[PDB]
Amino acid sequence: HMSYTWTGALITPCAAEESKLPINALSNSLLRHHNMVYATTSRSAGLRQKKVTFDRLQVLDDHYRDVLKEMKAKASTVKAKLLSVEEACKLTPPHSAKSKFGYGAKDVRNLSSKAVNHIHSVWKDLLEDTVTPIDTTIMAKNEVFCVQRKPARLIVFPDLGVRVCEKMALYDVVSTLPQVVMGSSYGFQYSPGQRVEFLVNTWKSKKNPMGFSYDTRCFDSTVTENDIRVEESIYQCCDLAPEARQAIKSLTERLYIGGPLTNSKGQNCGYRRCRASGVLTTSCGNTLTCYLKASAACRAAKLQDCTMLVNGDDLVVICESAGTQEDAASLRVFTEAMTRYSAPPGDPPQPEYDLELITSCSSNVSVAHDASGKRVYYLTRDPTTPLARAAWETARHTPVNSWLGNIIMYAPTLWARMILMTHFFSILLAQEQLEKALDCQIYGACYSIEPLDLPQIIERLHGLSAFSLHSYSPGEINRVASCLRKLGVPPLRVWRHRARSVRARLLSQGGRAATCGKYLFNWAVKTKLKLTPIPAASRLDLSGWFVAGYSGGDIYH
């Protein structure tokens, strides 16, 4: 029952990997402690292999089967459709990994005969053969962090042809089934403004609230053959075309439950018997499995008025407190149940009696005040990793612009507004790239976004108050200041100064640019402009935003 077996062949790169922060003329204006920032490489892959390789044991009781029966009954109400080849081709990111079979993602998107013909052949094979393990490639992710040094995370994914077939069989299912099965507990249905409302409303609904986050140790490696067969039994409760059923069964037996791991040089690295990080069903499978195990563990622990919020492997629970000693004992029971279900913790969970000290999806609730002095809740995080990734992106073009996803999702925060907005609008002005669309990821899917659309995007995701917040909390302010000292980032007084310049430049461009100057940087001037609802906000097509999660899913929206 091991998560992986290995041959000793190395996990190899496909191009040169940099680990040191690249430096250019713009670097010092953001961050001086360059030696604090690094990127992960295949050189640490071996250390990750060791961490992710362990035996799983799993004891399944009546609570587990009781929840699973309920989830199944809800899933039975879902009707899901097959996508056409052309619809699935349109969901492929332009820069997705090319096929081993002589075509690329651009050929897929174009519906080129070589690509479409091969995809039809993979589909036929999937319908005919429900036994043969499907090949996957294993690679080390290159991700940027601040020291305090993580080994590379691994990514495991099938060929591009197979990925298009996954979409055809399962895109509609994984996009629709989780919210039906899980209701308000499915986290990927929420925009940031919706997510903070749900946490606060939930917290407020309890007489004496308690909450905690649950950190599963290497969630993907804890997912067993049982878990993945249970996921398929849930998918199969849906009302589906017979062709879709056969494809889902085949994909489950041949790809999702396990298969051979091949490096970038074509050598066999070993064999996987746990979740693949780079398949379409990674997010939905992890969310269903986490929810099943956590709901059952809640019943085992006798938690009172229990609300869960689940985004894949990310779990928070808010419930009724029963006193500090019994809460501590209940959380032990919960952790023991989870452990018996094959989901033991990394960090053991702690009860918290302050909403603002709970982290979920790498974020906590904090409070600031709008133009009328009215309290507004918003989600924030420690800015260290966002700012390290921004320093890197200041000197290197990358396929995903973390800075842009961070402005979008953390737009209300003092650090996104003062540092990220200022710094990157400066760069776009100087380079005359204000109109250039950039790719970034939200809930695992890729979006191409125009930075001049940012004000309307932010009004939709957060409301107009995102542009007037002030009087942020002392905890939040100190956590930012602490980060700036650590990374060597100029203090906020300098940022306010630069923001005025940036704002004046943007207003001097007219049009969409001036709207960015007006809304995004109203905080930097004492003589304020009046900020009214933006007409363009009402016409923005944000469909496909905040419907589901697609981590590893190879989705472009």
Ligand X SMILES: CCC(C)(C)[C@H]1C(O)=C(C2=CS(=O)(=O)c3cc(NS(C)(=O)=O)ccc3N2)C(=O)N1Cc1ccc(F)c(C)c1
Q: Looking only at residues 476 through 505 of this chain, which bind ligand X when binding is defined by CB under 6 A?
A: none
Q: Which among 113-121, 306-314, 478-486, 523-531 is the span making contact with ligand X, rule CB under 6 A?
A: 306-314
Instruction: Please give the angle made by the CA atoms of 337, 339 and 343, to the nearest 5 degrees.
Output: 115
Find the helix or strand (DSSP H, E) in which 4 lies. strand 4-6
Which range touches ligand X (CB under 6 A), out of 27-35, 328-336, 406-414, 466-474?
Answer: 406-414
Residues 334/193, Cβ–Cβ less than 8 Å: no
For residue 220, count CB atoms less than 10 angstroms from its CB and return exposed for 0-12, middle for 13-18, buried for 19 or more. Answer: buried
Q: Angle, nearest 10°, between helix axes 492-507 and 511-520?
A: 150
61 carries a ligand binding annotation: no
Least spacing, CB of residue 444 vs ligand X, in Å: 4
Residues 4-33 that bind ligand X (CB under 6 A): none
The bridge status of strand 304-311 relative to strand 314-320 is: antiparallel
State yes or no: residue 314 binds ligand X (CB under 6 A).
Answer: yes
Applying CB under 6 A, does 406 fall inside the site for ligand X? yes
Q: Work out which of 42, 222, 283, 456 binds ligand X, going by CB under 6 A.
A: 283
Specify the DSSP class assigned to residue 274: S
Q: Is 314 annotated as a binding residue?
A: yes
Closer of 49 and 441 to ligand X (Cβ): 441
Q: Is 66 annotated as a binding residue?
A: no
Closest to ligand X by CB, 104 vs 344, is 344
Min dist CB 170 to ligand X, Å, is 15
> Which residues contact residue 69 at a Cβ distance below 8 angstroms, ignoring those fewer than 6 apart?
none
Residue position matching structure tokens 């064999």: 271
Nearer to ligand X, 195 or 503 (CB): 195
Contacts (CB under 6 A) with ligand X, residues 185-244: 192, 195
Strands of 196-355 (E only): list them: 209-214, 259-262, 268-272, 304-311, 314-320
Would residue 156 be called left, alpha or beta, if left means φ above 0 and alpha means ψ between -120 and 50 degrees? beta
**Cβ 192 to ligand X shortest distance, Å:** 4
What would the x/- binding string for ligand X be over residues 412 to 451, using CB under 6 A? -----------------------------xxxx-------
Three-class SS of residue 304? strand
Residue of 409, 457, 466, 484 that binds ligand X (CB under 6 A)? 409
Terminal-to-terminal C-alpha distance of the chain: 38
Residues making contact with ligand X (CB under 6 A): 192, 195, 282-283, 286, 311-314, 361-363, 379, 405-406, 409-410, 441-444, 549, 551
Binding residues for Mg(2+), by number, are 215, 313-314
Annotated binding-site residues read 215, 313-314
